Paper text:
In this article we describe the crystal structure of [name], an enzyme responsible for the glycosylation of wall teichoic acid polymers of the [name] cell wall, a process that has been shown to be specifically responsible for methicillin resistance in MRSA. [name] possesses a catalytic domain with a canonical GTA fold (one of two distinct A/B folds characteristic of nucleotide-sugar dependent glycosyltransferases) consisting of two closely associated α/β/α sandwich Rossmann motifs that abut and form a continuous central β-sheet. [name] possesses a D(91)XDD motif with aspartates coordinating a metal cation, a feature that is typical of the GTA superfamily. Altogether, [name] features a novel architecture with closely-associated trimerization domains connected by a linker region to three protruding catalytic domains that face away from each other.
Residue numbers in the entry: 1 to 204, 217 to 349
The structure:
Amino acid sequence: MKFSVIVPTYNSEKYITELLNSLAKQDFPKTEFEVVVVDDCSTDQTLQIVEKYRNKLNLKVSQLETNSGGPGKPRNVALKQAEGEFVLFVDSDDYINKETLKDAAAFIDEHHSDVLLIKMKGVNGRGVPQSMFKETAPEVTLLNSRIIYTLSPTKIYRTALLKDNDIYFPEELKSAEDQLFTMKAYLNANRISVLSDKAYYYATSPEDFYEVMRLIAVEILNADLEEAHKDQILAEFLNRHFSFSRTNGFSLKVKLEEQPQWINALGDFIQAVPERVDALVMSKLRPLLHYARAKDIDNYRTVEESYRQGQYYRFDIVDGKLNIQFNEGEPYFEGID
């Protein structure tokens, strides 16, 4: 088979059909794809609604004997069952365009992609990564595009890519586990493609979270790539992470007494990042990497408060940028813009 649509479900009764409908209206033979539903022990009758489609859709259904508390274990069970050449993970609260597997299969055979991103579209007023879906491109890398800014599994992966290199979702860690999954697939793919000719996918404690980030840093730095390139990929991940994750501004939002917990977990993540990589990151994040690596919340918070108020202990203006000293006796950080 060409594809395996993978659907993790838990109490998905209210909108599972709109998903299963989109899989039935596919301008693509039901002969060449399967829908692999693995239910995380739903109370309602999602699995009964899913059974209505067993005579129109090539259909596989399992149910876990107990709730795992996340989509990781459901997806992994579905991934091991899948026989299709390519795999697509879909949220039961979502649906896909009718041309999706039509256009993907056509694209895949032209350019034998290992990973194919398909352009997304938010419904009901739902934020969706945009910056990497402005062009269709049969070949993008982690360093010439913004694919690292979208790590959701709502993408098309070659099944053997995930299976040959043992890429599976974390089951033990349940915050942002999909980022480690898609990062691994990126680093292992020989060809990554972006297809944007239309909109295909429609979207409707810190110790676990930063354990995943530490594993991502470990995974980049041990990839089978050139040393200079590994450092640059990790720099781009840290740019994205400090701009868009919960790390951004945490010393301004998190309650003071919980902040030592955050700096300790963030520090174990940043201590896996060699200091040499700080020079590759956006200059404004270098002070944050510095005090995170030292696990110094007071100076970390001062930097973030200083940024937020535009108040600095001392600074110079050189080449239209700021060289900032955030506290007495602390180093100057240069080129901040």
